[PDB]
Amino acid sequence: MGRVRTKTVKKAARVIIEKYYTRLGNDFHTNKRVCEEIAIIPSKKLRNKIAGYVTHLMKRIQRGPVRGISIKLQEEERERRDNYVPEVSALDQEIIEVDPDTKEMLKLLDFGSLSNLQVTQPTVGM
Amino acid sequence: MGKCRGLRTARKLRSHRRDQKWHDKQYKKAHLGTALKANPFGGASHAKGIVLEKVGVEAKQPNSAIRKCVR
Amino acid sequence: SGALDVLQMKEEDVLKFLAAGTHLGGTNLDFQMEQYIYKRKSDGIYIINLKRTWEKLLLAARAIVAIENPADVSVISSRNTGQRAVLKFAAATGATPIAGRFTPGTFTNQIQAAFREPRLLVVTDPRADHQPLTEASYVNLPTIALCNTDSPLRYVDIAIPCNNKGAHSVGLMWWMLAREVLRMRGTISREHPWEVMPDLYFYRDPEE
Amino acid sequence: VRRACYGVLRFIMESGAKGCEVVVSGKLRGQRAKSMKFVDGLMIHSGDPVNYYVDTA
Amino acid sequence: TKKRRNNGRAKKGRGHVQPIRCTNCACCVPKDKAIKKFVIRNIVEAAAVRDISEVSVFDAYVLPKLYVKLHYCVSCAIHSKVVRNRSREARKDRTPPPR
Amino acid sequence: VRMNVLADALKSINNAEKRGKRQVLIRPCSKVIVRFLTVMMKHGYIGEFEIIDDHRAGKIVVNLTGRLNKCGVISPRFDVQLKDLEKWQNNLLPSRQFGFIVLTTSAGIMDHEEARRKHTGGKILGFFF
Amino acid sequence: GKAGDKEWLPVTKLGRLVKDMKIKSLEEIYLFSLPIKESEIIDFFLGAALKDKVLKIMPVQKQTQAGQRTRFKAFVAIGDYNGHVGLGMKCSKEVATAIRGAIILAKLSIVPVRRGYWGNKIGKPHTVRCKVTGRCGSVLVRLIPAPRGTGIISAPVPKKLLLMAGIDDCYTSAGGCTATLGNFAKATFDAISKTYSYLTPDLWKETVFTKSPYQEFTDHLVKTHT
Amino acid sequence: MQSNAGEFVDLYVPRKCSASNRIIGAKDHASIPMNVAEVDKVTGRFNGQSKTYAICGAIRRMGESDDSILRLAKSHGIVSQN
Amino acid sequence: KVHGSLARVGKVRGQTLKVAKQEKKKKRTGRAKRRMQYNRRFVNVVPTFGKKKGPNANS
RNA sequence: GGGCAAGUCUGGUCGCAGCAGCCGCGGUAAUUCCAGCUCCAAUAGCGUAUAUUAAAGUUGCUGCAGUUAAAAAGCUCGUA
RNA sequence: GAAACCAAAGUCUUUGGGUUCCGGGGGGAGUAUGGUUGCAAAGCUGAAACUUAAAGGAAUUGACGGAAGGGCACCACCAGG
RNA sequence: CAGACACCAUGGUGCACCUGACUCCU
């Protein structure tokens, strides 16, 4: 219920993750001594809360990027997987069933395709 | 606003303006002669009179002092 | 206009307008977008005029063209379907992409987390980008907006009619508007169309 | 009153202060008590570091 | 000023209407200026149905429903919280909450 | 009904220039309406206008420009013996440097400028600036 | 012994073109109709005759959970006597903070007013070309031009405001509430920016629609950002 | 706004619009030009000078500027398919 | 209300008293008085010194 | 004391005496008193009273306001 | 537009469609006074003396509620000692 | 949504107050 983590732990631990994601681990006494090594924390107990929340973060972030913190190794890899080719934007929807007014737009664009029909049971859309 | 306006309405606004002007507090009592009637001035600038009595008036609140008028 | 022929829609464009579904629109009555509507479907779904799409696709590009920097062209996509597209627009055009929230104050707000100095804004949906459109109106910024048949039009400068909502109609126009500027200024010069497909474009669709 | 508290409060900030505040408290302009607060910089009051971090007169 | 625009409920297209009492206070309020309420409710409510339906023998007949149209005066709608104090921006809302 | 066929038309074109609108459908089209339209057409406050001939009362479609700021009516009209004309140029025109007042005078409907040049008044119509 | 300093900083494309002697006057931006977020742009261009007028520092207040809470609502106007006037309102807890705040708000909000002639055609403008007006809470402040030698016939609050314009010859007739003086000057500020807003036939000669000196200087604007 | 024949009274000349025939004033916001590049004439590789069109906020806040430049860029040229 | 009894007349005037102050130089009158009022206020020394006063202000 | 120019004077007074058109002082460290002094103002005048004109677009002809501040008749026909 | 709000409570100082009705700070008071109707009840027309620098309107901000909706403390309860 | 709802009166007072400058001469 109590001693929930305020702004000071989470803002400090975030900078620690994105720079030290190799040298951080998931053992506290590693990361407590790592936050001795890599950080200047004015209390051991504050270092207990920070490096413990680092172990909270490192457990989360080794499950990929979690909300509120991310690493560019994970972030750019999303963009590297975002070379995704779904189409060539030519299916071919060359002649297939389209709207008759799209057909009339295709008539104004001189290709044409199969046209929808039958105003029946109106509202068309109901 | 809100009024009739035409080319024969000089007869109207002659009646309409003064009759609305009668609703004025300053226009009514000054033209009722009541300021001459209720008050001794209105028909005088200075007026001489006999002292009836000297009235040492304790002021109704606020401004706590004694007014000390004369009748 | 440039090379007038492929600037009068090629079937490669025409199929892609049908492929991305840009020709479709909403169901709502307009008074500023009904000129851009070609026809309406049975009991109302608006086929927009792709002529009005392309001719505004040209001129709004020509507004960006002969600005000697894409850096003062801040292109805006709060829609995630265009966030890959403005990533691939800024990859191609070099413009300034704006993804997601405007963070109100980049154009106002001396004391702020940010400040931007654009000249022309390009918008996926002026209802989804009204907070750009507010601070566009605050500090004298013209704004290109992709507008469908239900879009707002107040403070909206030159508007390209597209379906531009949800579908690949978003990422096709960013494929096409980065086409048109590299058509005008680029290595895809002299008004030639692209050889880059809109698959470097259309949005991520979380993969396997 | 303000001008001397413009002069010194600047000057103690000119020589340097994380925070610096000036209080002139009590009667002024007759029988009424007043307090004149002239604060510059950052002043904290939490817990233990209120006691260490200040220079008070 | 008009603290309410429709003043409980509008009377537009109607010069004058018929009044109604409160269903729980008998206070005279107009029909289209009061709080109405339909009630579709079982006659076999869930306190008894765990024992009625077991002793309901030769009863493959479904649970019956009671149909009550309630009408409150505004004074006994508010203190009983049939309706209640909303914000004036919420006072624009003509929306009944769902059942 | 339309007691003033000009004031019903002036509220049209002022609201049109409020909208920036470049067309109006005015009616019941007196010639007195037309003569005001011709003069302000000459002064470049507006463009040209095109009447559509109807046998009801006729209607005019007017292409205007945004050079006008206020066109008002003297409703009801009054007589001008060329001595009140300056006070309307005082009280109702913004300066004596611009602003035109139109009058029906017995040498025809004209502005205030030919009214002073001919010295023959009539009835006052309205103004435009 | 105590002295002040000034450091220039551009936060926009304009303030670079200000500091690099590419924009030389507000008259450009007044033609360009562009925003200004740096009052020092004005101070880069004129820096002189811009009379600061502390109108009213009126103590306004809000009641709180523990008694009340008050602030000084200072009305500081700027203007040189040349056709450019400004106004700043700063609601601060102090007086001089509300003054020196609304000083800079007057500096940033200086606007041009268009002076002209009464019935004159020459003589380096002395009044407005047109009767102008403005309201702020039912207080209508109408201005009427006068010829030369007449003077500024006004209430004492617009008389200073018409003075700062250089409109030296004007008549007034005001109706509304008689005591709310901040609404007097704010209604008066409506009429003076209306001087450009009236379309003179001298203003029928339209312009060439200038070409956005953001774009005209965007290569010169390359300092750390175009 | 000028005075006597050669003498200029006004501080400047405020801009205008072609869509409402209305001036663009002093510090007016969303009151902008629209510089549209002259792209050239099948030879290509756009020719420099952008076509300028001044837009006020009034036609913007009334949402008119889309058809307005369509009445200024299509009507005056140059644009393909028109 | 109804009350009409006086209590004290000149109660403060019997305990607040007056003197006079004689002219070392005269009260100059009319012409050279109003002439003196401009030249004394400005050109004596020509004003180069001072701020924040009225001509009687202990302020 | 402000409005309202020129006493955050000097003394006394202490909600008294008084003052104060109005807004207001005086209940003790009175800038409202009462005086001194100083200053301001006009000036052989200045001040008051009352009267009326403006200010006053608070009578609004120009040029008032009538949902909530005053002010659309219960509604309609209907003549002048 | 004072805001409240209002395509009307817009096209008003850039002041004018036409016609009718009504207000001139707050009272005294629709009382007096007379008219007037109505069977009456009462209805209608309609004051003064005197009283006053405020009355009023929206809106902001508090505070309050036998207004309503949230949370917490044995200086509050519970169970208790 | 879908179990049971009593009366409870009064009460009072002063201070929110109208401008700028920086020759500390270091």
Numbering used by the authors:
A (entry chain e): 1 to 126
B (entry chain Q): 1 to 71
C (entry chain f): 2 to 209
D (entry chain g): 115 to 171
E (entry chain k): 2 to 100
F (entry chain a): 2 to 130
G (entry chain c): 38 to 263
H (entry chain b): 1 to 82
Show the paper's wording:
During eukaryotic translation initiation, 80S ribosomes are assembled on the messenger RNA. This process is highly regulated and can be divided into several phases: a ternary complex (TC) - consisting of trimeric eukaryotic initiation factor 2 (eIF2), GTP and initiator methionyl-tRNA (Met-tRNAi) - binds to the small ribosomal subunit (40S) to form the 43S pre-initiation complex (43S pre-IC). Subsequently, this 43S pre-IC complex attaches to the 5′-end of the mRNA which contains a cap, forming the 48S (pre-)initiation complex (48S). The 48S complex scans mRNA from 5′ to 3′ until it identifies an AUG start codon in an appropriate sequence context (Kozak consensus). The largest and most complex of the initiation factors is eIF3, a ∼800 kDa complex.
Here, we reconstituted the human 48S pre-initiation complex (h-48S) from purified factors on capped mRNA in the presence of eIF4F and eIF4B and a non-hydrolysable GTP analogue (GMPPNP). After refinement and post-processing of Class 1 in RELION, the h-48S complex reconstruction reached an overall resolution of 6.3 Å. The initiator tRNA (Met-tRNAi) is fully accommodated in the mRNA channel, and the tRNA anticodon loop contacts the start codon on the mRNA. The position of eIF3 in the h-48S structure resembles that in the mammalian 43S pre-IC structure: the eight eIF3 core subunits (a, c, e, f, h, l, k and m), eIF3d and the WD40 β-propeller domain of eIF3b are bound to the solvent-exposed side of 40S. In combination with our cryo-EM structure this suggests a relocation of eIF3b, most likely together with the other components of the YLC sub-complex eIF3i and eIF3g, during or immediately after start codon recognition from the intersubunit to the solvent-exposed side. The crystal structure of eIF3d fits unambiguously into the cryo-EM reconstruction at the exit of the mRNA channel, but does not contact the mRNA. In the h-48S structure eIF3d contacts uS7, uS9, eS28 and ribosomal RNA helix h40. The additional density in the h-48S map is found next to ribosomal protein uS3, close to uS10 and contacts rRNA helix 16. Based on the cross-links as well as shape and size, we tentatively fitted the structure of the eIF4B RRM into the corresponding density yielding a cross correlation value of 0.931 in Chimera. Therefore, we suggest that eIF4B stabilizes mRNA binding in the h-48S complex by directly contacting the mRNA and the 40S.
